[PDB]
Amino acid sequence: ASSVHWFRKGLRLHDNPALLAAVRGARCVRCVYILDPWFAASSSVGINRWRFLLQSLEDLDTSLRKLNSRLFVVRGQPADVFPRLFKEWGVTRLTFEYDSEPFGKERDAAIMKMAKEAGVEVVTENSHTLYDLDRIIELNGQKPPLTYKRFQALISRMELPKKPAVAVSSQQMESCRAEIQENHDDTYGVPSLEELGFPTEGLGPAVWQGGETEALARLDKHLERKAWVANRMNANSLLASPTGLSPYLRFGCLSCRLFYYRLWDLYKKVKRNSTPPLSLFGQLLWREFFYTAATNNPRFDRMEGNPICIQIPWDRNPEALAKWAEGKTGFPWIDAIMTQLRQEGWIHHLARHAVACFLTRGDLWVSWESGVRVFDELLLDADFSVNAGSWMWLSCSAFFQQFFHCYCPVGFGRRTDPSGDYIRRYLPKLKGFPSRYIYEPWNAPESVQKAAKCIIGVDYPRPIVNHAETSRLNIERMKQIYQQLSRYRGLCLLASVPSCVED
Amino acid sequence: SIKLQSSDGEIFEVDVEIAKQSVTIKTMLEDPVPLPNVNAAILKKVIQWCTHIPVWDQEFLKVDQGTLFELILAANYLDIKGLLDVTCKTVANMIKGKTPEEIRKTFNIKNDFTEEEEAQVRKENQWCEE
Amino acid sequence: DWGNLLQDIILQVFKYLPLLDRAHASQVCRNWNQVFHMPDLWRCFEFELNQPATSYLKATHPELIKQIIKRHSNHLQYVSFKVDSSKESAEAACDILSQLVNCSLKTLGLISTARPSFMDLPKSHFISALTVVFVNSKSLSSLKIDDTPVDDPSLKVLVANNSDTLKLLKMSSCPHVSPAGILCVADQCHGLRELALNYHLLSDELLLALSSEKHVRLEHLRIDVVSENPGQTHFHTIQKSSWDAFIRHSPKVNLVMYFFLYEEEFDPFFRYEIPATHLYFGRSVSKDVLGRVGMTCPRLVELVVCANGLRPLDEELIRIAERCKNLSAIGLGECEVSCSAFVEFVKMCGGRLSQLSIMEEVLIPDQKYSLEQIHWEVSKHLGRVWFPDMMPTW
């Protein structure tokens, strides 16, 4: 069996049953990653994501050398690359980890049709998510749960997620090690940022190193018993922890089930004789919840044609969008967030809310689809389901939430880090301002602006909205929207919010 | 407590004290046995009601097109802001979603629109999409 | 047949279909088509004025707009304009208003979807268009006119025209109306059942003009309090004498107050018994002010706070449960309450709270309750399954 294994996500060798399947059969095994290098000059992805990806691939490549095989990086489209590769390798069996996402699913349907009528058998596993998303929906009467609390009610009545699959051994690697073509496997070699057309100059090391090896180490540190034992938000947390797992999850450099059980195990050994609360797994469960909600909704990342999304009249405004995208709003908190975003590829979820809210219902009133697109380009952990998900949640567009909670571009920031040292890390044209005025530079006397060598209106821009008058405007608009949706005639705002299936 | 009689036959009797909503009829002895083109599957109906999309009805209306057709034609005869309103509320549910062509099939309506008449109509109608 | 059923029948049916369904319906046959343009199906219309430049939505078809005006100008009674961010949109609305000479409107709404594009018009162009309605509609009941450049003079045209009719007036964020301005409205329009406006235009004279004898009983008064300019503005003060006169005349009145204030710009605010009934703090609130809310608002029904700060509010929530025996609905984010105090809170009102929305981070555990324990206790006193709200961690 000349079996090809196909990485898309699931960029790892641990808990990769699709790969166990490519292998169980003997004959030849090649691991490939199709990559579209001229779709890669396209802006749909910044350096940080691309760089994260190549490093995952390089690590994979390295991991495969340790198994006397190598990583095959073919270039172009899956369709009309798999054909040519089929003949050329006399391929027998193609395997990959299942993709629940609408586009992915469709893509994969075509690929498997085009494999049947060509003699190649296909085997898929689902190891990107904790459960079979399809089962969860079956059990919920063939509809996805549309609130997290309902999502939890259900999971709590369900069986535990499968345990992580063991990795393939060398043992069965030679049993199908391929003949790598010497100085030509580097016509299948992992490209470089320069190659994909990226200015590489004064880069510096990635804040989030890519690949399974890094992911596995971060896991162990993350779970180091007493460091872990913590559960009041910090501020230190705004900075990219070296134990954060989110990008590895999104790329599949880290198996989500592994993470699940190692979590379980440690909790067992700490709180002892006990079964833990679902909140322990909060990070993994929200992910599942967005995945589950997204599999059968191909318009999931849009407003129109999206059955779960409330139609809200956002204004198209590339001017305001740009100011937000570029960290040129007057608000240090907001601009500090967006700067760290663009720079490193990760920002704490509390900062995601601040920034998401500022853009949607809090201030700019720009559509959430636009926030999605910017995050898709900059945020390492933002895939289709999870990113559309949070944006619909945050803009109060879906999932039946309450819209009265405000994220102040000044207050919320000062309260999550009064010291101002976050702002002083990313907005350094403000080193000099005292904490007293740094969340609100324009409210400092010129005597203080000058001692800080920063003149609001010059060195740093002035706020682009009066938050108060905006707050008042946007609250009203939500009010109306939820009112005509509940048909609630009445004067309270907690009552305009439906809590499940429309009315 | 009084009594009546239909065009086809000579059968029925009914109160007027409990039947507090005998309207477009409260006009004969307001000056038996005086009723024309109607029938009987019209009595309990107005009777279950008239002491207060409720169903029942979905149960009570689950009849054949031909019957629903006359239920409405009878519905008017004797005003019924509930039982004509409701036979209508129904026909509506049948319509909502259809194309002009689908509404014609599921109602037996032959199309008597020349072609100018009809094209002129579909033109104005697309104005009702935003 | 069904084709020629009746026609006043088809109308009954049509009353039950949305516009596009009527349109298709009206295509079925000659006899049904004649039902479409009947006045009863045209008492009501909402104009969508928006542009691909500036809107993700769809506009009302331009041809439909002409047809409405040509064929139903005298059937229309309830009309609103939703207008998006572009000037051309606000200008289109005016172009439509200015043609409503044969209209007799009971209700008119001018809604700004996004940026307040009516403010982008030259004043007189807007006024002139609105005037066509003030003058020609003799039975005007409601008027929603937020984010609009209307002025004192035009209000006098309004009053002089429909003072025998006006019941709703919503007009907050209307910069060219001065306190002296509204007074004429309150004064002459004896039927004014409800009114929404900025605090700046709220005066003792106004309250008294509304507590007066000639006047009907108010059902609804909504006030917005906005920090519209610098980092700490100093609001004026109403005499308690005015507030007390006000509940006296209208004892079931609802008094909705939304505050968007900063650090204690609140000084003039909760200093004596107000008849306040609904409250929203859309910016931030002080523990001290919240205490004064407790001491001051025996009529609170709903209370929503979006943020407060640092000090656990244990005693403020307890006092409010204590003194607001009418409290049915309560929402809190971005502040702190001990679990124990929160439980003590729900024990008191409890069965009375139809709505209770708390973001998770608000609760602090103690020697007695852990985060995992409270949803069970709170649910028991509420009488329904209940949880603190969560936010996604992505």
Curated annotation (Swiss-Prot), chain A:
Changing residue 315 to R: what effect?
Answer: Strongly reduces PER1 binding
**One MF term in the entry's GO annotations:** phosphatase binding
> Tissue expression, per UniProt?
Expression in the retina is restricted to the photoreceptor layer (at protein level). Expressed in all tissues examined including heart, brain, spleen, lung, liver, skeletal muscle, kidney and testis. Weak expression in spleen.
- Record-listed FAD binding positions: 246, 283, 349, 381-383
Crosslinked positions for Glycyl lysine isopeptide (Lys-Gly) (interchain with G-Cter in ubiquitin)? 9, 105, 221, 323, 450, 479
Documented effect of changing residue 330 to D: Loss of ability to inhibit CLOCK-BMAL1-mediated transcriptional activity. No loss of ability to inhibit NR1I2 transcriptional activity
Effect of gene knockout: Animals show longer circadian periods. Double knockouts of CRY1 and CRY2 show slightly decrease body weight and lose the cycling rhythmicity of feeding behavior, energy expenditure and glucocorticorids expression. Glucose homeostasis is severely disrupted and animals exhibit elevated blood glucose in response to acute feeding after an overnight fast as well as severely impaired glucose clearance in a glucose tolerance test. When challenged with high-fat diet, animals rapidly gain weight and surpass that of wild-type mice, despite displaying hypophagia.
Q: Which InterPro entries match?
A: Crypto/Photolyase_FAD-like_sf (IPR036134), Crypto/Photolyase_N_sf (IPR036155), Cryptochr/Photolyase_FAD-bd (IPR005101), Cryptochrome/DNA_photolyase_1 (IPR002081), DNA_photolyase_N (IPR006050), Rossmann-like_a/b/a_fold (IPR014729)
Phenotype upon changing residue 475 to D: Abolishes binding of FBXL3 and SKP1. Strongly decreases CRY2 degradation
Q: Which residues carry this modification: Phosphoserine?
A: 69, 241, 274
Span of domain Photolyase/cryptochrome alpha/beta: 1-130
Which cofactor does the UniProt annotation name? FAD; (6R)-5,10-methylene-5,6,7,8-tetrahydrofolate
Q: Which Gene3D superfamilies match?
A: 1.25.40.80, DNA Cyclobutane Dipyrimidine Photolyase, subunit A, domain 3, HUPs
What switches on its expression? Shows no clear circadian oscillation pattern in testis, cerebellum nor liver. In skeletal muscle, under constant darkness and 12 hours light:12 hours dark conditions, levels peak between ZT6 and ZT9.
From Swiss-Prot, chain B:
Q: What does this protein do?
A: Essential component of the SCF (SKP1-CUL1-F-box protein) ubiquitin ligase complex, which mediates the ubiquitination of proteins involved in cell cycle progression, signal transduction and transcription. In the SCF complex, serves as an adapter that links the F-box protein to CUL1. The functional specificity of the SCF complex depends on the F-box protein as substrate recognition component. SCF(BTRC) and SCF(FBXW11) direct ubiquitination of CTNNB1 and participate in Wnt signaling. SCF(FBXW11) directs ubiquitination of phosphorylated NFKBIA.
Indicate whether Ubl conjugation appears among the record's keywords. yes
Name assigned to this protein = S-phase kinase-associated protein 1
Source organism per UniProt: Homo sapiens
Tell me the domain of life. Answer: Eukaryota
According to the record's subunit comment, the protein's assembly and interactions are:
Interacts with KDM2B, forming heterodimers. The KDM2B-SKP1 heterodimeric complex interacts with the PCGF1-BCORL heterodimeric complex to form a homotetrameric polycomb repression complex 1 (PRC1.1). Component of multiple SCF (SKP1-CUL1-F-box) E3 ubiquitin-protein ligase complexes formed of CUL1, SKP1, RBX1 and a variable F-box domain-containing protein as substrate-specific subunit. Component of the SCF(FBXW11) complex containing FBXW11. Component of the SCF(SKP2) complex containing SKP2, in which it interacts directly with SKP1, SKP2 and RBX1.
Its ancestry begins with: Eukaryota, Metazoa, Chordata, Craniata, Vertebrata
Pathway membership? Protein modification; protein ubiquitination
SMART domains per the record?
A: Skp1
User: Which residues constitute the cross-link Glycyl lysine isopeptide (Lys-Gly) (interchain with G-Cter in SUMO1)?
Assistant: 110
Annotated segments matching region Interaction with the F-box domain of F-box proteins = 72-130
UniProtKB/Swiss-Prot annotation, chain C:
Q: Which UniProt keywords apply?
A: Biological rhythms, Cytoplasm, Disease variant, Dwarfism, Intellectual disability, Leucine-rich repeat, Nucleus, Repeat, Ubl conjugation pathway
UniProt-annotated location(s): Nucleus; Cytoplasm
InterPro entries per record: F-box-like_dom_sf, F-box_dom, LRR_dom_sf
Q: Does the keyword Cytoplasm apply?
A: yes
Q: Output the superkingdom of the source species.
A: Eukaryota
Gene3D superfamilies per the record? 1.20.1280.50, Ribonuclease Inhibitor
Key word Cytoplasm present: yes
What's one GO MF term for it? Answer: ubiquitin-protein transferase activity
Q: Where are the LRR repeats?
A: 85-112, 147-173, 174-199, 200-225, 282-307, 309-334, 335-360
Which pathway does this chain act in? Protein modification; protein ubiquitination
Stored Pfam families: F-box-like (PF12937)
Give the UniProt record's GO annotations in the biological process aspect. Answer: entrainment of circadian clock by photoperiod; protein destabilization; protein ubiquitination; regulation of circadian rhythm; rhythmic process; SCF-dependent proteasomal ubiquitin-dependent protein catabolic process
- As recorded in UniProt, coiled-coil segments are none
Gene Ontology, cellular component aspect? cytosol; nuclear body; nucleus; SCF ubiquitin ligase complex; ubiquitin ligase complex
What range(s) does the F-box domain occupy? 1-47
Oligomer and partners = Part of the SCF (SKP1-CUL1-F-box) E3 ubiquitin-protein ligase complex SCF(FBXL3) composed of CUL1, SKP1, RBX1 and FBXL3. Interacts with CRY1 and CRY2 (phosphorylated). Interacts with HDAC3. Interacts with KDM8.
Q: Which PANTHER family match?
A: ES1 PROTEIN HOMOLOG, MITOCHONDRIAL, F-BOX AND LEUCINE RICH REPEAT PROTEIN 3
Protein name (database record): F-box/LRR-repeat protein 3
